[PDB]
Write an enzyme that holds these catalytic residues in place. Structure first.
Site, short mmCIF file in Angstrom:
data_model
loop_
_atom_site.label_atom_id
_atom_site.label_comp_id
_atom_site.label_asym_id
_atom_site.label_seq_id
_atom_site.Cartn_x
_atom_site.Cartn_y
_atom_site.Cartn_z
CE1 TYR A 123 -2.63 -3.22 2.23
CE2 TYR A 123 -4.27 -1.91 0.79
CZ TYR A 123 -3.74 -3.21 1.64
OH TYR A 123 -4.72 -4.18 1.72
C1 F43 Z 1 -0.98 -9.39 0.25
C2 F43 Z 1 -1.72 -8.87 1.34
C3 F43 Z 1 -0.69 -8.18 2.05
C4 F43 Z 1 -1.21 -6.42 1.64
O1 F43 Z 1 -0.64 -5.38 2.12
N1 F43 Z 1 -2.51 -6.66 1.58
C5 F43 Z 1 -3.02 -8.22 1.35
C6 F43 Z 1 -3.90 -8.48 0.28
C7 F43 Z 1 -4.98 -7.16 0.16
C8 F43 Z 1 -5.69 -7.39 -1.22
C9 F43 Z 1 -6.30 -8.71 -1.61
C10 F43 Z 1 -7.06 -8.80 -2.80
C11 F43 Z 1 -6.45 -10.15 -3.52
O2 F43 Z 1 -6.78 -11.40 -3.04
O3 F43 Z 1 -6.07 -10.03 -4.77
C12 F43 Z 1 -6.90 -6.24 -0.80
C13 F43 Z 1 -8.33 -6.70 -1.29
C14 F43 Z 1 -6.54 -4.84 -1.04
C15 F43 Z 1 -6.56 -4.55 -2.63
N2 F43 Z 1 -5.42 -4.59 -3.41
O4 F43 Z 1 -7.76 -4.63 -3.20
C16 F43 Z 1 -6.78 -6.58 0.78
N3 F43 Z 1 -5.73 -7.21 1.15
NI1 F43 Z 1 -5.73 -8.13 3.12
N4 F43 Z 1 -7.71 -7.86 3.15
C17 F43 Z 1 -8.69 -8.13 4.37
C18 F43 Z 1 -8.05 -8.97 5.51
C19 F43 Z 1 -6.87 -9.35 5.87
C20 F43 Z 1 -6.42 -10.40 6.86
C21 F43 Z 1 -7.00 -11.65 6.65
C22 F43 Z 1 -6.86 -12.66 7.37
C23 F43 Z 1 -7.82 -13.98 7.42
O5 F43 Z 1 -7.57 -15.00 8.12
O6 F43 Z 1 -8.50 -14.28 6.27
C24 F43 Z 1 -4.89 -10.45 6.65
C25 F43 Z 1 -4.11 -9.58 7.62
C26 F43 Z 1 -4.30 -10.58 9.04
O7 F43 Z 1 -3.94 -11.54 9.10
O8 F43 Z 1 -4.91 -9.69 10.03
C27 F43 Z 1 -4.68 -10.11 5.34
C28 F43 Z 1 -3.57 -9.88 4.61
C29 F43 Z 1 -3.13 -9.61 3.24
N5 F43 Z 1 -3.66 -8.53 2.72
C30 F43 Z 1 -2.03 -10.24 2.51
C31 F43 Z 1 -2.36 -11.28 1.92
C32 F43 Z 1 -2.95 -12.59 2.85
C33 F43 Z 1 -2.83 -13.81 2.24
O9 F43 Z 1 -1.93 -14.17 1.65
O10 F43 Z 1 -3.82 -14.61 2.39
N6 F43 Z 1 -5.80 -9.41 4.88
C34 F43 Z 1 -9.13 -8.98 6.65
O11 F43 Z 1 -9.02 -9.39 7.68
C35 F43 Z 1 -10.74 -8.37 6.29
C36 F43 Z 1 -11.01 -7.52 5.07
C37 F43 Z 1 -10.09 -8.00 3.89
C38 F43 Z 1 -9.96 -6.87 2.73
C39 F43 Z 1 -10.99 -7.09 1.98
C40 F43 Z 1 -12.18 -6.42 2.51
O12 F43 Z 1 -12.40 -5.54 3.24
O13 F43 Z 1 -13.46 -6.80 1.96
C41 F43 Z 1 -8.81 -7.21 2.35
C42 F43 Z 1 -7.92 -5.93 1.76
C1 LIG Z 2 1.38 6.08 3.18
C2 LIG Z 2 1.11 7.04 2.07
O1 LIG Z 2 1.62 6.11 1.23
P1 LIG Z 2 3.18 6.83 0.49
O2 LIG Z 2 4.04 6.31 1.41
O3 LIG Z 2 2.99 8.17 0.56
O4 LIG Z 2 3.52 6.15 -0.87
C3 LIG Z 2 -0.33 7.18 2.00
N1 LIG Z 2 -1.00 5.91 1.51
C4 LIG Z 2 -1.78 5.40 2.67
O5 LIG Z 2 -1.82 6.10 3.61
C5 LIG Z 2 -2.81 4.45 2.27
C6 LIG Z 2 -4.00 4.39 3.10
C7 LIG Z 2 -5.31 3.16 3.20
C8 LIG Z 2 -4.62 2.08 2.44
C9 LIG Z 2 -4.07 1.26 3.62
C10 LIG Z 2 -4.88 0.22 4.37
S1 LIG Z 2 -4.91 0.08 5.98
C11 LIG Z 2 -0.54 8.02 0.57
O6 LIG Z 2 -0.80 7.43 -0.57
O7 LIG Z 2 -0.30 9.25 0.79
O1 LIG Z 3 -1.31 -8.30 5.19
S1 LIG Z 3 -1.39 -6.98 5.87
O2 LIG Z 3 -1.67 -6.89 7.31
O3 LIG Z 3 -0.02 -6.20 5.50
C1 LIG Z 3 -2.84 -6.36 4.76
C2 LIG Z 3 -4.19 -5.95 5.46
S2 LIG Z 3 -5.33 -6.03 4.30
#
Ligand code: F43
Ligand SMILES: C[C@@H](OP(=O)(O)O)[C@H](NC(=O)CCCCCCS)C(=O)O
Ligand SMILES: O=S(=O)(O)CCS
Ligand code: F43
Ligand SMILES: O=S(=O)(O)CCS
Ligand SMILES: [Cl-]
Ligand SMILES: [Mg+2]
Ligand SMILES: [Mg+2]
Ligand SMILES: [Mg+2]
Ligand code: NA
Ligand code: NA
Ligand code: NA
Ligand code: NA
Ligand code: NA
Ligand code: NA
Ligand SMILES: [Zn+2]
Lengths: 548, 442, 247, 548, 55
Positions: B366
């Site tokens: 992100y």
């Molecule tokens: C690649 C990342 C790291 C990153 O920065 N963001 C990810 C992935 C990203 C993608 C997943 C989309 C896809 O599958 O292609 C999106 C949807 C963001 C986006 N690009 O649209 C997202 N996460 Ni994540 N992500 C979530 C969550 C979580 C939970 C999922 C845990 C579980 O046991 O299933 C964990 C973090 C945790 O352990 O606390 C997690 C990790 C992760 N989060 C791990 C991948 C985990 C894995 O390999 O399966 N998300 C959540 O806990 C709930 C909501 C959910 C988001 C989507 C929504 O809000 O509907 C999503 C929000």
């Molecule tokens: C940190 C900062 O990103 P940069 O480090 O500036 O690239 C900032 N993004 C974020 O704060 C992303 C916020 C929401 C998505 C994260 C999910 S918790 C930005 O785009 O202004």
């Molecule tokens: O796996 S991470 O905690 O970095 C992403 C939450 S959607």
């Protein structure tokens, strides 16, 4: 007698909600879902029309090895797949943000003093009515002075208009009632009385610019567009020169000296102008939501309608698209407005407080924080432990942390009548939760929460602020999901329990008590359900100027 | 005389320099070497003459992949660098004997410029450094080659980039450690918006000096922000002392004791023991097989904990020779110490919180990036008031080449020019000497 | 060091995982080559890739910190930084996310640990990672039913168990064999098929999971009944709250 | 033989264009116009439906005491009333801005080195093609890693995709051609060789996010949304851990280190983030316009297609809505793309220069500026004097100032092959026009034109900049209509005369050479005409999720 | 009337120490004068410096 989320858990799964085992892997993947099946077929259509591959269920990992669940929109009997609650697929959610983005509140108090003191002309209810007829012609994009002007199609901008309000009932009665937000009609007696006392004899415009312009342009367009047509209408209705020195006083009044933006502008790393979600402070969001004027005997319902309002706006559209994007953050927000789960935990804490202290009667100190927030935290986490279906529903730790702490922080404010101790309760809930399950949220979830306790009562420059004044640009809150919407709820909580008419700004509260809005702010969760069912009709579409 | 604390000051080899220095002799408000560092950073600019010449010759000006076909100007700038720099100095200086400095580097490819202090004395902020330097070099280049009125605007675009159409100097061939005033996250933040890589670059990857420069910049910003005023002043000064100035050799001695085999956890145990040994903390209550510690001086506990934190970074990231784990160390040092003792962690949770988001925004999709692009003005790492970033600087100093966005990639022009300035490169030396020198004025 | 307050078995388990002098119980035997296979970063008998030249071939700043801090072996060689990631079931897995990161930074050098609700990760120099990973996989950090090695698609910490007592895995990397009562790893941690599966032994039984777990739960030992542990957390809240206001 | 504007003037008026007298007041006011009639009727329906007066022809002064004119869209045979060229009423104009706002250019060069140097993996045309299939599922808002993700509806986001380009013909050839902007097909052979040399072996993505999201959110969303789905697709296609330290290098590369925004952010008084009109420099706007690759033997046509693109975007949407609003600025812009008037003046100047000097063969100095700008200024003003119908058509002095100066500036740059002398010519034109008729534009029109001559060749901090780098945020240019789009045209002019493939950024030029765009950038004025006639079909509509 | 000492600007990048040092000194002096509680002192901050840092 059942917990409020029991029906929802029975709808989603074949097992009883207390069963610890289930069956995976034989559900057909995406084929179990009506919605995923629509998407697969749509992806084939799209790709074949445009010549570029698009949605394809076999890219990456195969969704639907577990049950893809329906969600109950809380307070409703509507069950939908989560995809129907994504802001992209939900016109109610898009319109809720457009109705906020396209609104500005603009005084008439300085303007009427320009007219009387600088032009030396009179202002009465009749001149104001004439002025309002003029500005309701001009605001949508039509002309009043020059020859050979070309104008907006009135049917494309049908949602643009200007109304007024005032605390003086006898003045309000003399303005044509078509243009008046009637405070005594819209608000219960005691709230009306409070709001009219705040406004006094001031007269204020509520200006809504066209949704089609807001979507073409941005939030910072609203107050400019407003000022342009206020200015033209002042020229026309009060017989100025069309462009003399005194004209400038109206311009500065409308853009600067008596303007109330919905949001303030943001710093460069998240550069945005006014009237974007990040500038809307939590107190204003609680006042935009109109649950307070309709559900005023049920402070839980008011507070959780605010949570739904802010979780969708702040997590789905703001953090999940403006600040990030993609699939985004639908279920990080749906956890706070689905399955009656937050409702069950918050009614629990409201009842606890009411029975032990009386609403608003606990001492405003750390002893109450420690009592209420601990008790409610332990209630909510026990539900996940007692009902394996509940823990599988709210499967991400962040979702659980936001829900449990929202209940704990609202409940704490219910007891003290003060948001600041409610917020202290939110952070203590996170700390207890983290120790209880040895986990809390996603990788970056508790940045604000570990700073949290120390910054609740700080008075330092970029640390100290009453919760009502905080928003998405408060430094520790600027980045992460699963907090901002809940904080709007905690700001509402102490005021709902007190029976206050507003949380932070009484003009903002009156401005959204307007039946000509497209979205219904008195029933935010109802509207989300309507949009999920594809039954909401938004403004701003281009059908009239495109081929049938 | 406002505070009674005294500290012993050491060098970056662990040798005592000066014993019993009043704490306020290290205040940014009193110490002349901190003043000189700050005034220096305000007024120093790096000029890339080679870059200007290459931009003009190709007509590549105004930002990434931009070019104007037909505008090419072939000028032998580096070949006439002496003349150009001397002509520029004439415009930059106020009088012939002032503190203006212009020095050619790399055979004329680069120039270190320090704009005279007199211009900042009648200035609101610090932008006169880049703007006065840029116009003096634009004018000197035009005058050197008699560039016509019709073409001179290309010289301006090669020096300062797309400004004023962009808000920043987009595509500029000058560089400063500070960034423009519009990019401050809040008023008072300018001394925080200095990339960690630039700090590491200027101090040549000497770990303690990088920690020192970073801490001086962070804690000085805390005075400009007003955070170090009144009730909090002493906490900030003790933080500067123990975390960034190796006060009492506490950082140095914890690293010595844990460097060969230690972990974050072992540093913690040594620190708690040392805080016990010194009387900073004491047992307040006994639970079941668990002692709860208390303190009558939170500010001093915080400082000791802060010193432990720096040493745990140096041990953990130093053992990997890889900076990325600093986010983890900033988190779990503080998490672990709270459950070890019953006392609040560094900056009362704010380091820990910073570390949570910093970890996210350095191991996810992100935003952020590697440790070296962060700084006290970054939205991810602004939250702790001076106690987190100096650890990042120390971790990047210890990195042996695991980063793609390393100081070599982001900070090469800053390194070549700003490392020449003795006080920037070895601030720990100058600040300790000054504090010794004013030690009886407190 | 005392590590953690509390008078439950959970609290003692938490303290034991942290304490480097506590000998983790070994439950299973895994070959070095099968550790490398499960990680999936390289093929067994493939030389370690490098990110930079060995430390002795570089010219380093004169730096007393560098001199006092001994580099792990992978740092000396210039190995990649690589990872191993585990998911722990809330149905009484022995280790849990914050317990892992707290314990990793107490036991292991040169570690970058990350804690999330559904995943917990450590990144370090590749050859050192392979040594830690042996201990993470062979001891009571790991149960093959209630824990999972997952570099992606981590869903399952909060899900119900299947009929065998195994945690959900979208990619089914760990397969319970009804015939042996044992679990095999069939895929590496990122989900690619292994040429030969790896025996991970038998799941711990219900009563052994209860004795070894570090999660508090109403059907195990509840956190609210660990009143000394709760008291310290409440104390930290209060002291952070007061310090941010004044000192 | 006829001037080029003679047909239009004859369609507008019953008189021959040379006649000096006419009849007024007896045309029926608004009733003469089909479009005004539609609007009065719609106003009445709107007001009745919502309960608030709206469009009313009896408010203010009575339009249509003179002929309400049809306008010819230059280079077409479409005639429409001016209301049909208002951006609100014209979906082609809205879609032109959406297509720019939702586009970001993002290198794969750093990303591929993270893969090879940090992760130690290989990158090939095959891995690239796999990545591009992955990102073309993910980019519209669908999932590749996590279980239980909810997704955007593919049909609502059908316009979102990712393509690549590269100057290396052999690599380009290996990638699936569905994902490749083919430089050798889209550009004439000399242009293709230039562009491929600029790009070399770099590989660049052109990312377009969905119009529906750009309309809900803002321009600063585009690069964030792009970076999220690039990051997910890199995780999926190259098998990282899903979230390790090296993931962060992809995020930083995609958001900062190899990103080309269409616009840069703006200062606080006009606070906006990236990818808003005021941040788009004139040389990028010229390169977005694709007239250069199709009309490359006619430098006038290329330049004036750029004028049309910029006059609409910068004066109607940007200055006329984002920076002001209301009825706004349709005809300040339509003067530069209607009735073939700019085309007649500019073809005159091109022929003058061609005959006296040879294109690009005049000395680049003040003697050429004085010569060409003066001669073309006197030519244009003389048409207004000889054809009263022409003066009645472009009735506002500002309109005539911009048209004559654009012709004078463009012609001066056709002679010198340098934009900066073209700009000097624009200012001189203004000064000569002011003295000739003792008027110039609206009250505040020539703020920039009086600062103009002195700032053309300045080198000072906020004054000096080659014209190709200037844009709407150049200080003197930040406020006023009737200049920015003509400046984009003058930026194009010398490059069009020289036969250059791009004006300022070769990546931007190639990125819009894409037949999957919704708007056709090869024929801007043709598209404005199609939208005026209600024949253009935009992206972003919500019809699929709303009631029938 | 408040004039913040020059020595604070001598080690500052710009000029915001004036409002920020003045604001916090008056916030803390008001809190100290009346012994405002921890729970209510954030109101004194809002009264002095307004909505900052949300604005
Ligand atoms: C690649 C990342 C790291 C990153 O920065 N963001 C990810 C992935 C990203 C993608 C997943 C989309 C896809 O599958 O292609 C999106 C949807 C963001 C986006 N690009 O649209 C997202 N996460 Ni994540 N992500 C979530 C969550 C979580 C939970 C999922 C845990 C579980 O046991 O299933 C964990 C973090 C945790 O352990 O606390 C997690 C990790 C992760 N989060 C791990 C991948 C985990 C894995 O390999 O399966 N998300 C959540 O806990 C709930 C909501 C959910 C988001 C989507 C929504 O809000 O509907 C999503 C929000
Ligand atoms: C940190 C900062 O990103 P940069 O480090 O500036 O690239 C900032 N993004 C974020 O704060 C992303 C916020 C929401 C998505 C994260 C999910 S918790 C930005 O785009 O202004
Ligand atoms: O796996 S991470 O905690 O970095 C992403 C939450 S959607
Ligand atoms: C009130 C002002 C002063 C002000 O700041 N802007 C005005 C009015 C504003 C309104 C008029 C709409 C309406 O009639 O209600 C709008 C449309 C802006 C808005 N609020 O939407 C506009 N001007 Ni003006 N304005 C215009 C023009 C001009 C020309 C018109 C000269 C004439 O002989 O007709 C003159 C300036 C000049 O003398 O050069 C001018 C004046 C004026 N302009 C005088 C009123 C003139 C009058 O009393 O008739 N416009 C033009 O020169 C062309 C374009 C035109 C704009 C609409 C469009 O572009 O289609 C409009 C642009
Ligand atoms: O009359 S003014 O020139 O002020 C406005 C031009 S539309
Ligand atoms: Cl103190
Ligand atoms: Mg063995
Ligand atoms: Mg006739
Ligand atoms: Mg004639
Ligand atoms: Na059921
Ligand atoms: Na899939
Ligand atoms: Na005719
Ligand atoms: Na009228
Ligand atoms: Na403004
Ligand atoms: Na529909
Ligand atoms: Zn928009």
């Amino acid at each position: 007698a059942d917990k409020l989320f029991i029906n929802a858990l029975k709808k989603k799964f074949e097992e009883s909600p207390e069963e610890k085992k289930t069956t995976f892997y034989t559900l057909g993947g995406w084929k179990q879902s009506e919605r995923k099946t629509e998407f697969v077929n749509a992806g084939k259509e799209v790709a074949a029309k445009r010549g570029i591959p698009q949605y394809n269920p076999d890219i990456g990992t195969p969704l639907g090895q577990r049950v893809l669940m329906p969600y109950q929109v809380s307070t409703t009997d509507t069950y939908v797949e989560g995809d129907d609650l994504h802001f992209v697929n939900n016109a109610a959610m898009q319109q809720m943000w457009d109705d906020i983005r396209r609104t500005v509140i603009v005084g008439l108090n300085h303007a009427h003093a320009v007219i009387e003191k600088r032009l030396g002309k009179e202002v009465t209810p009749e001149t104001i009515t004439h002025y309002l007829e003029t500005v309701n012609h001009a605001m949508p994009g039509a002309a009043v002075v020059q020859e050979h002007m070309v104008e907006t199609h009135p049917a494309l901008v049908a949602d643009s208009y200007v109304k007024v309000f005032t605390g003086n009932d006898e003045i309000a009665d003399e303005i044509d009632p078509a243009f008046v937000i009637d405070i005594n009609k819209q608000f219960p007696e005691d709230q009306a009385e409070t709001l009219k006392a705040e406004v006094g004899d001031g007269i204020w415009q509520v200006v809504r610019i066209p949704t089609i312009v807001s979507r073409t342009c941005d939030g910072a367009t609203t107050s400019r567009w407003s000022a342009m047509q206020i200015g033209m209408s002042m020229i026309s209705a009060y017989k100025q020169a069309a462009g003399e020195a005194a004209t400038g006083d109206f311009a500065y009044a409308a853009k600067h000296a008596e303007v109330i933006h919905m949001g303030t502008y943001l710093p460069v790393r998240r550069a945005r102008g006014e009237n974007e979600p990040g500038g809307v402070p939590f107190g204003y969001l609680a006042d935009i939501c109109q649950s307070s004027r309709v559900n005023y005997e049920d402070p839980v319902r008011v507070s959780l309608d605010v949570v739904a309002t802010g979780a969708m706006l702040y997590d789905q559209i703001w953090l999940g698209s403006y600040m990030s994007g993609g699939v985004g953050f639908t279920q990080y927000a749906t956890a706070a407005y689905t399955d009656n789960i937050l409702d069950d935990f918050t009614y629990f804490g409201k009842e606890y407080v009411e029975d032990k202290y009386g609403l608003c009667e606990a001492p405003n100190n750390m002893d109450t924080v420690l009592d209420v927030a601990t008790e409610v935290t332990f209630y909510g986490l026990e539900q996940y432990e007692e009902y394996p279906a509940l823990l599988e529903d709210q499967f991400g730790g962040s979702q659980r942390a936001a829900v449990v702490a929202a209940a704990a922080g609202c409940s704490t404010a219910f007891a003290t009548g003060n948001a600041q101790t409610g917020l202290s309760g939110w952070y203590l809930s996170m700390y207890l939760h983290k120790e209880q399950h040895s986990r809390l949220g996603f990788y970056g979830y508790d940045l604000q929460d570990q700073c949290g306790a120390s910054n609740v009562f700080s008075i330092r420059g970029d640390e100290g602020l009453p919760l009502e004044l905080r928003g998405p640009n408060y430094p520790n809150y600027a980045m992460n999901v699963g907090h901002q919407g809940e904080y709007a709820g905690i700001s509402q909580a102490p005021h709902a329990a007190r029976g206050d008419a507003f949380v932070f700004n009484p003009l903002v509260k009156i401005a959204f008590a307007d039946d000509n809005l497209v979205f219904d702010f008195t029933n935010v969760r109802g509207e989300f359900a309507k949009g999920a069912l594809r039954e909401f009709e938004p403004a701003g579409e281009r059908a009239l100027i495109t081929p049938a | 005389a406002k505070f009674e604390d005294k500290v012993d000051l050491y060098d970056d080899r662990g040798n005592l320099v000066e014993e019993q220095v009043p704490l306020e002799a290290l205040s940014p408000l009193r110490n002349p070497a901190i003043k000189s560092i700050v005034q220096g950073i305000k007024r120093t600019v790096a000029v890339n003459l080679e870059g200007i010449e290459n931009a003009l010759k190709t007509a590549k000006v105004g930002g990434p992949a931009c070019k104007i076909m037909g505008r090419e100007l072939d000028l032998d700038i580096v070949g006439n660098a002496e003349s150009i720099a001397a002509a520029a100095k004439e415009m930059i200086q106020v009088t012939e004997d002032d503190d203006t400095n212009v020095e050619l580097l790399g055979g004329g490819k680069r120039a270190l410029v320090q704009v005279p202090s007199a211009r900042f004395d009648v200035a609101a902020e610090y932008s006169a450094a880049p703007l006065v330097t840029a116009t003096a070099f634009v004018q000197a280049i035009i005058n050197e080659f008699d560039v016509s009125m019709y073409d001179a605007n290309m010289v301006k675009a090669a020096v300062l980039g797309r400004y004023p159409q962009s808000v920043e100097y987009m595509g500029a061939n000058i560089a400063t450690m500070l960034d423009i005033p519009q990019k401050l996250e809040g008023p008072g933040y300018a001394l925080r918006n200095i990339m960690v890589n630039h700090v590491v670059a200027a101090t040549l990857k000497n770990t303690l000096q990088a920690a020192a420069l970073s801490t001086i910049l962070e804690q000085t910003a805390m005075f400009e922000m007003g955070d170090a005023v009144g009730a909090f002043e002493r906490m900030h000064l003790l933080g500067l002392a123990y975390q960034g100035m190796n006060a009492d050799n506490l950082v140095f001695d914890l690293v010595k004791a844990n460097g060969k085999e230690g972990t974050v956890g072992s540093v913690i145990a040594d620190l708690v023991e040392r805080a016990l040994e010194d009387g900073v903390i004491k047992v307040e209550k006994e639970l079941t097989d668990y002692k709860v510690y208390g303190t009558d001086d939170l500010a001093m506990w915080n400082a000791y904990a802060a010193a432990g934190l720096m040493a745990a970074t140096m041990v953990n990231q130093g053992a990997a020779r890889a900076a990325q784990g600093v986010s983890s160390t900033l988190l779990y040092y503080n998490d672990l110490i709270e459950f070890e003792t019953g006392l609040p962690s560094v900056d009362f949770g704010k380091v820990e919180g910073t570390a949570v988001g910093f970890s996210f925004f350095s191991h996810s999709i992100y935003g952020g990036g590697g440790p070296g692009i962060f700084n006290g003005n970054h939205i991810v790492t602004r939250h702790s008031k001076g106690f987190a970033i100096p650890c990042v600087a120390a971790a990047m100093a210890l990195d042996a080449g695991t980063q793609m966005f390393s100081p070599e990639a982001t900070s090469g022009l800053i390194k070549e020019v700003f490392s020449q300035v003795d006080e920037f490169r070895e601030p720990l030396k100058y600040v300790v000497e000054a504090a010794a020198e004013i030690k009886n004025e407190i | 060091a005392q590590y953690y307050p509390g008078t439950t078995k959970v609290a003692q388990n938490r303290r034991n995982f942290c304490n480097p002098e506590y000998e983790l119980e070994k439950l299973r035997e895994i070959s070095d080559e099968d550790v490398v296979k499960i990680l999936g970063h390289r093929a067994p008998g493939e030389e370690y890739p490098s990110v930079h030249p060995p430390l002795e071939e570089m010219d380093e700043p004169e730096d007393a910190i560098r001199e006092m801090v001994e580099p792990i072996d992978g740092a000396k060689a210039g190995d990649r930084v690589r990872y191993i990631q585990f998911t722990d079931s809330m149905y009484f897995a022995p280790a849990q996310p914050y317990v892992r990161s707290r314990a990793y930074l107490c036991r292991y050098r040169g570690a970058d640990a990350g804690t999330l609700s559904g995943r917990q990760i450590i990144e370090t120099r590749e050859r050192d990672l392979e040594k830690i990973s042996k201990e993470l996989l062979e001891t009571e950090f790991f149960d093959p039913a209630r824990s999972g090695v997952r570099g992606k698609s981590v869903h399952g910490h909060s899900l119900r168990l299947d009929e065998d007592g195994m945690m959900f895995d979208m990619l089914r990397r760990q397969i319970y064999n009804k015939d042996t009562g044992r679990v095999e790893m069939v895929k590496n941690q990122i989900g690619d098929e292994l040429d030969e599966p790896v025996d991970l032994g038998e799941p711990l039984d219900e009563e052994t999971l209860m004795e070894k777990t570090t999660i508090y739960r109403v059907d195990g030992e509840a956190y609210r009944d660990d009143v000394e542990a709760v008291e310290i957390m409440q104390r930290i809240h209060v002291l952070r709250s007061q310090g941010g206001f004044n000192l």
